[PDB]
Subunit: 99 residues, 3 copies
């Protein structure tokens, strides 16, 4: 159902699409944009059947220092997201996804 959690997931997903569009036209992403993009990589990766361990590593390869504004890699200590896997929902933590 469209629980507040489901709405929130779809919002984060569209926010990631929008942040990707911004980056693709040359902008460096700000902190919430970078979070959306990394979170969306996790969400979609889980939907593909990637494992938590795979996502913990690949979520660190999505954005680099060049992709985000000054200060963003330092402010983004980790991204934590509940993703849906084949074997249920799991919290995925990507540590230090940019630096």
């Amino acid at each position: 159902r469209l629980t507040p959690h489901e709405q929130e997931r779809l919002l984060l997903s569209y926010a990631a699409e929008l942040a990707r569009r911004r980056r693709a036209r040359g902008l460096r992403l700000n902190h919430p944009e970078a979070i959306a993009v990394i979170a969306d990589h996790i969400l979609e990766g889980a939907r593909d059947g990637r494992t938590v361990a795979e996502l913990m590593a690949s979520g660190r390869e999505v954005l680099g220092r060049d992709d985000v504004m000054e200060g963003v890699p330092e402010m983004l200590a980790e991204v934590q997201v509940e993703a849906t896997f084949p074997d249920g929902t799991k919290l995925v933590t990507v540590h230090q996804p940019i630096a």
Copy 2:
């Protein structure tokens, strides 16, 4: 300004976009994803100027068994969408859409 319901409709439209994105990615759709895609087909066909009769038909040719997870086509007895027509808002029902 968007009403909380308008926001609901747009969220479900985006969910269908994400579903079509996943299907494009080679993923067989689950139950809610399939619903979102068929729902969206109806809403977009109504916007195009299609009749309720046309949409009940075309709605059954959006996704086949190959496009969805095993079990989904039997879970999806119907998809109902309130769609706006020049004639008014009507509930459009697509029966056994995966078939």
Copy 3:
């Protein structure tokens, strides 16, 4: 994580993506779709660090009479959106965006 207002702004941004999709398939936009597109132009221009005056001018050149249904240009007296620039939030109004 998102306020009502943030949710609404993200959904209005999505509405423009949907309006672009409708246009791409050969639809002329209606009044609310046109509002979304012009609003998106402003919001994205603001994010880009364009100036209010730049956007008030370029907002008049996003959609032409061909892009919208007959009688829509006359319906669109103005499109007003709050947008956050590098120097903060401003109400931006695009006047007579089509004709």
